[PDB]
Amino acid sequence: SSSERNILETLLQMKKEIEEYKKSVVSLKNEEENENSISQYKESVKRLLNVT
Amino acid sequence: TNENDPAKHGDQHEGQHYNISPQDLETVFPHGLPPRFVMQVKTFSEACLMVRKPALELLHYLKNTSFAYPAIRYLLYGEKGTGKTLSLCHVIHFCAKQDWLILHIPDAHLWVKNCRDLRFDQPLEASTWLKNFKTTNSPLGEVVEQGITRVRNATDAVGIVLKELKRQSSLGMFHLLVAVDGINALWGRTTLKREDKSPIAPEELALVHNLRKMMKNDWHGGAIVSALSQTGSLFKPRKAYLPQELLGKEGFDALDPFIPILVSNYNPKEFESCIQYYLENNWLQHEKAPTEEGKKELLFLSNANPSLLERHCAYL
Amino acid sequence: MAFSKSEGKRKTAKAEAIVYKHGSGRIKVNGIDYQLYFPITQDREQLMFPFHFVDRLGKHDVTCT
Amino acid sequence: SRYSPEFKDPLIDKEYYRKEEKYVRELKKTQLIKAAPAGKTSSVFEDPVISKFTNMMMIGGNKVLARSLMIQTLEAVKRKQFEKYHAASAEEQATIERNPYTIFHQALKNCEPMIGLVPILKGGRFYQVPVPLPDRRRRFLAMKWMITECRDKKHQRTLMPEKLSHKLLEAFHNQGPVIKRKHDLHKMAEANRALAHYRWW
């Protein structure tokens, strides 16, 4: 579902970083969730915008 | 302690408790939170909330996201406490003070409650939401009453009424700032059970499916937030706030990607300030108040919490 | 700040506590605080009795198992 | 004998130790010590009266639930007081009292039977012997009467906390079932102005 994931990401952005989000999604798919995946998700979300 | 300006806006003051609409409460959320909040307001008269850290984050996210941005899920995941509904209540109060369209809703768990016996439909949550909208404050009322009363072939009926409410394009239902308490028990494994083997999957239901679709980039207005609370969790373990593990893979994929930072709890300084205020007001009743033992017991057992402070105040 | 490691037993029970030295903050229990682990008031009093006697309320962290 | 003759209970008193005595302290030290219990936790919230009340209200060995229900009933009484004072009406602190110590004192005063009844026969017929009792036995009988009255369990509609709160509010104003039982006991004792000499102890 990387296609729809990136679509929703671009929507949140408007309505570098996309590659990082895709890699984070891949890591999520690679092995079940733990903590590093959530950390990468938080990182990508922070890189999207800039207001903490 | 108390806010120095009932008028709401870009509110800050991280700690001191604000004051919700006293007599004008009917125009904010007269029907939503359980009777716990009613008892709290009755025993404290004023209030015991505050501009929490999650509330500050929500306000900051809503500041630079006016009606241009339709909806951006500000999923605030944290620890057990940290407040997961008082922030939404404060946001609704601020929106009401700013003359913005607001319509409080009860909860998601209260909507998708368990049932003894049971493309189908359900009258429970639909009728609840419609009654809440009616009691909050053209063919609109006609179709509302129709959806409230008729619940026969309710699949297409609720679909059409939802599409109409989203296509009204006018005052009312323009930007719904829902105050859900537990939007997690929906995408993962729905509480609705199946009489046969294999429980219902998130991609099978109808009414809740359309209710979620209403939040899928619909009604282009002001930004909102869906809190994945846990105080009223159902059929889930404690501390339910994870992204995918809480809603599976596809369940979270269907959601929007956005999670900021973990939230913290109360502030000890303002908590002690409010404790001293209450002491000066004479309310603890317990004769062991005028002494360091009482303050120590408070700082220990309470640990800056609302329910524990209320219990300490209403001991005897 | 020396940190000790003790253990407690009571009617076929076991519990190892790791209380640190001076350090006002919170009494944790494997990430969970005492407030989130003892919903009862008498349990709170039992857990506080050491600090209640020593008079040092909030000055040591713990990670008891 | 489940208790070992070696191990012995401790002494939880500590407020006095804040300033012959040294010898007593050394003796207490030289004693096979034991651990303290959880039910009868002699902490700051260990009120002997309320402790005994909860112990008697204990069902199936659930002293935790008993204490929780007692605290909840006290909170409900204080909430009714607030409704009569703060919650509903305006704060009228001049004609309302929120201190349960007055209720406890009124109970200790007008809920104590000062005359016991023991069926002591002499030959082959039971005779009521009004025998005096000390303060401990009188207080114990008062507590037992209060608790067994609060635990009616026969109305088949009232709940435990509601029952307790209603009975306490009824007995507060120098009435209720406990004071009526005390009056009946006093009348029965008065009815035996001569049969008070058939006591073996």
Curated annotation (Swiss-Prot), chain A:
This is Small ribosomal subunit protein mS35. Belongs to the mitochondrion-specific ribosomal protein mS35 family. It is found in: Mitochondrion. Disulfide bonds: none annotated. The chain holds residues 256 to 323 of 323 of the full protein. Residues 2-50 form a coiled coil. Component of the mitochondrial small ribosomal subunit (mt-SSU). Mature mammalian 55S mitochondrial ribosomes consist of a small (28S) and a large (39S) subunit. The 28S small subunit contains a 12S ribosomal RNA (12S mt-rRNA) and 30 different proteins. The 39S large subunit contains a 16S rRNA (16S mt-rRNA), a copy of mitochondrial valine transfer RNA (mt-tRNA(Val)), which plays an integral structural role, and 52 different proteins.
Curated annotation (Swiss-Prot), chain B:
GO terms for biological process: apoptotic mitochondrial changes; apoptotic signaling pathway; mitochondrial translation. This is Small ribosomal subunit protein mS29. Ubiquitous. Component of the mitochondrial small ribosomal subunit (mt-SSU). Mature mammalian 55S mitochondrial ribosomes consist of a small (28S) and a large (39S) subunit. The 28S small subunit contains a 12S ribosomal RNA (12S mt-rRNA) and 30 different proteins. The 39S large subunit contains a 16S rRNA (16S mt-rRNA), a copy of mitochondrial valine transfer RNA (mt-tRNA(Val)), which plays an integral structural role, and 52 different proteins. Interacts with DELE1. Interacts with NOA1. GO terms for cellular component: mitochondrial inner membrane; mitochondrial small ribosomal subunit; mitochondrion; nucleoplasm. The gene is DAP3. Changing residue 310 to K: In PRLTS7; uncertain significance; slightly decreased thermal stability; slightly decreased GTPase activity. Its EC number is 3.6.5.-. As a component of the mitochondrial small ribosomal subunit, it plays a role in the translation of mitochondrial mRNAs. Involved in mediating interferon-gamma-induced cell death. Displays GTPase activity in vitro. GO terms for molecular function: GTP binding; RNA binding; structural constituent of ribosome. It holds the Pfam family DAP3.
From Swiss-Prot, chain C:
It comes from the Eukaryota. The modification N6-acetyllysine is found at residue 21. It is found in: Mitochondrion. Signal peptide: none annotated. Component of the mitochondrial small ribosomal subunit (mt-SSU). Mature mammalian 55S mitochondrial ribosomes consist of a small (28S) and a large (39S) subunit. The 28S small subunit contains a 12S ribosomal RNA (12S mt-rRNA) and 30 different proteins. The 39S large subunit contains a 16S rRNA (16S mt-rRNA), a copy of mitochondrial valine transfer RNA (mt-tRNA(Val)), which plays an integral structural role, and 52 different proteins. Belongs to the universal ribosomal protein uS9 family. This is Small ribosomal subunit protein uS9m. It comes from Homo sapiens.
UniProtKB/Swiss-Prot annotation, chain D:
One of its GO terms (molecular function) is rRNA binding. One of its GO terms (cellular component) is mitochondrial inner membrane. It comes from the Eukaryota. Coiled coil: none annotated. One of its GO terms (biological process) is ribosomal small subunit assembly. It holds the Pfam family Ribosomal_S7. Keywords: Acetylation, Disease variant, Mitochondrion, Primary mitochondrial disease, Ribonucleoprotein, Ribosomal protein, Transit peptide. It is linked to Combined oxidative phosphorylation deficiency 34: An autosomal recessive disorder caused by mitochondrial dysfunction and combined respiratory chain deficiencies of complexes I, III and IV. Clinical manifestations are variable and include congenital sensorineural deafness, lactic acidemia, and progressive hepatic and renal failure. PANTHER family: RIBOSOMAL PROTEIN S7. This is Small ribosomal subunit protein uS7m. It comes from Homo sapiens (Human). The lineage of its organism: Eukaryota, Metazoa, Chordata, Craniata, Vertebrata.
